[PDB]
């Protein structure tokens, strides 16, 4: 298996020293770059960008700059998706967004674990959990999503939530850890 | 009433889809995309940008870089506010921030509710609770205040904190939630 | 004794109004602001940068923009040392970083401690605590780390966590504030 | 009291050497000249500029590049406010435009008195005098007004008019000197 | 009638806020723009530019920047016309100018009437006053002519002259307003 | 003898065709481009321009953007002199400017004469009448000053003035054309 | 349906005046144009667009500028596919192209078929014939392929082709109109 | 005669060596670099070159880049002409090219014959023979028309057609040579 | 043998995996780059980059852009050699052309064979066959030449013309495939 | 003969006034200018401008920035020639440089005698004397040689030499006149 194999299946990884994983980011890299330096007013070129990073044809996904993300490709999303400011999508594990989607300012979704023995760690060892994002969700701000973690469909994550583990849908969670407050009435 | 009206009056309003607000909202991008973009040696020229993001003759208004804010003009500053990088000013709701105010780097100042129940929130729907920062205050990194909160004068918040209600004035405040510590002697 | 000199002795310093500082601050500032708007294909330049930041000749030390430091002169750092993006490294108090650290993204290692008092905290005194890393740490995402804390050999600290006191080598520490969960074994 | 205090007390004041003077006219001589270094299709750059020099949030106030004054601040605009091409409102006195006011191109507001003396002239001294331009008023090209003069609303000033005193409501006036030739019905 | 069409025939018309007219105006400002930024040594460039303004391909047609005209096509040249700095041929009404005249500096062609009613110019009424300039003339700087106005062949204005009526041919004129002074004899 | 060296001594010369004159002509226009197009705050290379513009090493001798003139060599300078926006120095024949001079915005120093016949004007001929500025005076914006005239020294010119003849020292004088009102004293 | 579903049915659709196709066809000239302004040794940056322009991740799919197209992500390309100086890929009807193919430069595959009755066609009606390109063939230099075509896997099309039927499998093809000559062998 | 007229005039003339001539083509080349090197989405800036490269103000003219033309003002166009990429209009006989015109991408309209005997072609003689395009037309890709043809109204000219005499009104017409098909009814 | 030597000596070589061809082709890309955004009145700037494509000192090579070539060393050039807009020569096989050669627009000289076999091909080897090009030759425009071919000093090759086989001197030819017509009589 | 003719032929030539030979040197300071204002990492464009310079294809010729050369094609080079910062190769006699060659910095190699006599050398003459570098020699900086001079095969130059006399192969050699110290044993 290739070290992106690895990474696909929720193996040990060589995320550090392998160079297809290094060029696969560095193209994601120079996108974001690119993209954190276009104008706001500069809406096709913006759009182009943002299909070019996310390896597909967005439906109003609004990204508010700057923008980061480690491939892209591996970031799944549905439409009607509001990025705020900073946010940051590491996707080596695959980060699933469902439509009808905010996500507030200096958000991190991060996919990555570590070795916590630092012998293999040192070596650039990563396993990489997926995180799934519900649709019609709306996190806060200052928000962090684990490794695996999965928020059900229609749950609201309060700012400042470290959130460890799963949250079930309809569900009002926050804290760090983030827990679980009251469910949700999503009906008329 | 126009949705800015709305806004303006802590009701629920079409943030996401109104033309006006769309286009305020965009000449703030613009503003903080050119200051953000901005060699910090250009004295005069990040002066004249932040002037014109808050529509105000700054006195001693220092912005580290970079800086973000929805309006710009619903930040209302007083003398000698120290703001260090990567802050957010979400003012949907107006953000009144006093004298000798200052503020560690990455804090948000967020105004904005949005709908618990997805279906309004998809329609767009916020409403803005204004903010309000007392004179002779400090605020640690990684701070962040939510909707309609007052923090009192001669208060310090923590590093870390998630400002989910009022601190009164002299206070030291810390935690997610943020609780008052203890009270501060401000006397020589 | 200049500012600096008392700056660097851990007692009071005119850190807002003395100009040898201000005047170091600019030039740290230029430089991040130079490296943070290189492509990142621009491998040579980035290096040069980065050297020239934190006045080294590095070995491996790769930053993830943007990244942000006061001085950068009081950086100190090993060899293999993985800053993710937007990390801020606020030296005014040296930071000590050993070898094989992996610093994750939006981390803010802050060494500066202002008075509670407003009135001695308007005039701009500041007093500056170093903070030690040990090589072989492991920093999640979102960390704050607070004037004078040494975070021991060989830990790892969770994703969120708020640092304020002390934390022994080879633990596992999580929280706001941060907290020792359990021992790491480092050995094969 | 200081130089600014004595100008807008109609008071001699130094304003050729007083430092905050000069910086402000330069604030004002960088924004005319970036305003008028952007194209004219680039409407919302120039937006932003026009709202930058006159510290306000325009309604409807187009101007023509090039376009010069002196402090920016001190020019209160009405809306509907059209200013053709080469104009400059020296605005050290007040200059206070109504609503719906039509300005030719080619046209000078002037509120700088100098001294007749050359001996008082040379050490920079001059006098402010406020310009006045009612609502409903129409400039045509050429025109000069001259310190301290007041033009009532609905009237219209011929082109080349050399303005050297004040000028009743809803009159017609032309010349050099600028002399009331008849009144205007202004109804339906 | 489209508003172009009742411009052209001398018919109130909405100068202000009809599109294809706004349209031709930004074309034509956006032509001025680009020809008033380049060199003077540009001579290709130059030539281009003013082609492309005038809609023609001129003969010995010499503009000296900056130079203002608002529709640009709607100004008729002969060749050999010497135009100095910051001349401003306003269009709306067509200007003929015949071959060899020679146009000082600061010079304004002033085709547009506004109605004296403020409620009517205020709704962006104009009535479009052709000026016709024969060939064989010269006219000094800081000159206007008003709207509807023909100067004759071969005659001579002064510089500072407004320009309110017919000159006839062969004749030199001055003043404000112009009056004829002599005849001039054209002959060998 | 050269066309350069008639023009010097005040005899008709063929200014429109003579390379030499074409070539200084377009030396000095090169100049004002880029002063013109250059920034405010960029004191030294504004300096530099000017200096190169009059061939001199100036001394406070400001120049507000913009600027013309046709040779810039033949503009002969004394110490303090203030010239505001938008003035040309039409100086075919000398234009010769005392010590402690202001002059407005707008004004025109023409020293080009043209034949009346047109038969020799369409020839390219001028004659050249060099203006004289004495020391210590004032002129107000909108002015106008012929070919040949002196402006005494200590003299005050009113705004939109057309001066067609000599001014007798320490006098205010005003109008078009130009008339002497009464003398200034000129004394403590 | 919409006019892209017309298109995508092999239906009548008005190709010229829908502005979702107006939309996407603009997408694609701005990424063609960007590319074909793109030196050739920016490896990355090339790598990207094509990626941006198809709308998947290529491999090995080499394209010598210029090159257009119309839509971009309706060219479905297999890997190493090596395309010559200035093609055209008009892609309104999709373009399937193969493993191992080789285009020359200056070829056409036109997918669009307008009516001959220039009634229906003035109208902007267009209908999509799908071009098939199979795997393992070359095309020489100025070949045009007509809408509807197929071309056989293994097929060789001589230089200056016009491809207005299908050719069949192995086979070696010339002309205008293109002719099978005979076929290939293709085994060792 | 001047060459200019000889080519105007269907004889012989110094196409190489004319200096006029020679000009006239680098100001078409010149026009057409700018426009080639217009990003497509600059429509303004598009339609201003498109206008000064035929010299005449046009009615839905589209040009799809790159373009090249000869002389640009020696081509006649109709509203509603549409050329897609990579045009040539070899200018030197006149090209017409009436209303609802499609021309396909690589077509060449070639006016200029050279001698056979290449001693008079060294030399740089050329004769131009103009092109007569009918309103109502269609040309597919890679068509080339010689000097001299008319392509009568309501025709359609197949895809890599080399037009070598002239095609009737109402008729298909393909092939190198191309010959005509049949008739065309156009009629509802 | 290099691969470089054996395409130089018309063997079969690895045109598509050889480093040093693959550089030497990127060296000329980039170099065709430079010259086709160059700006056509830059004569010096593209003399040189033409000089450096052919590695030559030129005599009057007039090339008109785009130009594309697959080394440029391998194209001998006579003196008096025009070459109109977007023509290639491909290289491979030396293409030599003489002195006093008409080259039309949309040309393209072919050198490269590839395997018919689709195996061999798919391995990158090519065979390349020079190309002879008579001195005092004339090409229309759309013409292609494939390799091996020889053009007999003194003939004319009819636009669209696919060059097949050998054309004689003094010959006229034209057609796909390309077939002599008749003799030129090439005398006085 | 012409001047070049004359040059190449070691007789006195008109070198400051004729034309082709201006041209030629200046087309050498244009390329010199290119290469000493490109950064050192950009290989290929480093390497295409010395093979332009050179009028060759070399092989391993490095040129250490900023370099001079009169002519470029009158410097014939070998293999392996290192060439330090600030050369110049005053080539209007020929510079024949081996292969193996290293050249020190602020090394001068000039080839043009001017006479003695003031009358000829101001009219421009110059007579050139080729210098001949053999091949596996080495000069040490800030060296000088003169016209005429031959240096040995196997031969090193001291730092600061003035090498006005042939120097003998396998010749260590030093001063101010350069002279022979001993004989170099160039054997394993």
Same mark, same amino acid.
């Given at each position: $298996?290739?070290? +992106?194999? =690895? $990474?696909?299946?929720? +193996?040990?990884?060589?995320?550090?020293?392998?160079?297809?994983?290094?060029?696969?980011?560095?193209?994601?890299?120079?996108?974001?770059?690119?993209?954190?330096?276009?104008? !706001? @007013?500069?809406?096709? +070129?913006? +759009?182009?960008? %943002?299909?070019?990073?996310?390896?597909?044809?967005?439906?109003?996904? @609004?990204?508010?700059?700057?923008?980061?993300?480690?491939?892209?490709? /591996? #970031?799944?999303? *549905?439409?009607?998706?509001?990025?705020?400011? /900073?946010?940051?999508? $590491?996707?080596?594990?695959?980060?699933? %967004?469902?439509?009808?989607?905010?996500?507030? !300012?200096?958000?991190?979704?991060?996919?990555?674990?570590? &070795?916590?023995?630092?012998?293999?760690?040192?070596? *650039?060892?990563?396993?990489?959990?997926?995180?799934?994002?519900?649709?019609?969700?709306?996190?806060?701000?200052?928000?962090?999503?684990? &490794? *695996?973690?999965?928020?059900?469909?229609? @749950?609201?994550?309060?700012? *400042?939530?470290?959130?460890? =583990?799963?949250?079930?849908?309809? @569900?009002?969670?926050?804290?760090?850890?983030?827990? #679980?407050?009251? =469910? %949700?009435?999503?009906?008329?």
């Amino acid at each position: $298996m290739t070290e +992106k194999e =690895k $990474m696909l299946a929720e +193996k040990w990884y060589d995320a550090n020293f392998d160079q297809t994983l290094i060029n696969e980011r560095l193209r994601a890299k120079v996108i974001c770059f690119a993209l954190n330096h276009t104008n !706001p @007013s500069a809406t096709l +070129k913006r +759009k182009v960008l %943002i299909d070019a990073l996310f390896q597909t044809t967005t439906d109003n996904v @609004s990204i508010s700059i700057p923008f980061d993300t480690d491939y892209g490709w /591996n #970031v799944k999303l *549905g439409k009607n998706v509001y990025v705020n400011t /900073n946010c940051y999508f $590491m996707d080596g594990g695959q980060i699933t %967004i469902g439509d009808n989607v905010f996500i507030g !300012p200096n958000c991190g979704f991060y996919t990555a674990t570590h &070795p916590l023995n630092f012998h293999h760690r040192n070596e *650039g060892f990563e396993k990489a959990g997926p995180i799934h994002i519900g649709s019609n969700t709306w996190f806060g701000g200052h928000v962090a999503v684990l &490794p *695996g973690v999965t928020i059900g469909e229609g @749950s609201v994550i309060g700012a *400042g939530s470290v959130v460890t =583990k799963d949250i079930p849908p309809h @569900s009002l969670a926050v804290g760090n850890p983030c827990k #679980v407050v009251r =469910k %949700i009435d999503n009906d008329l």
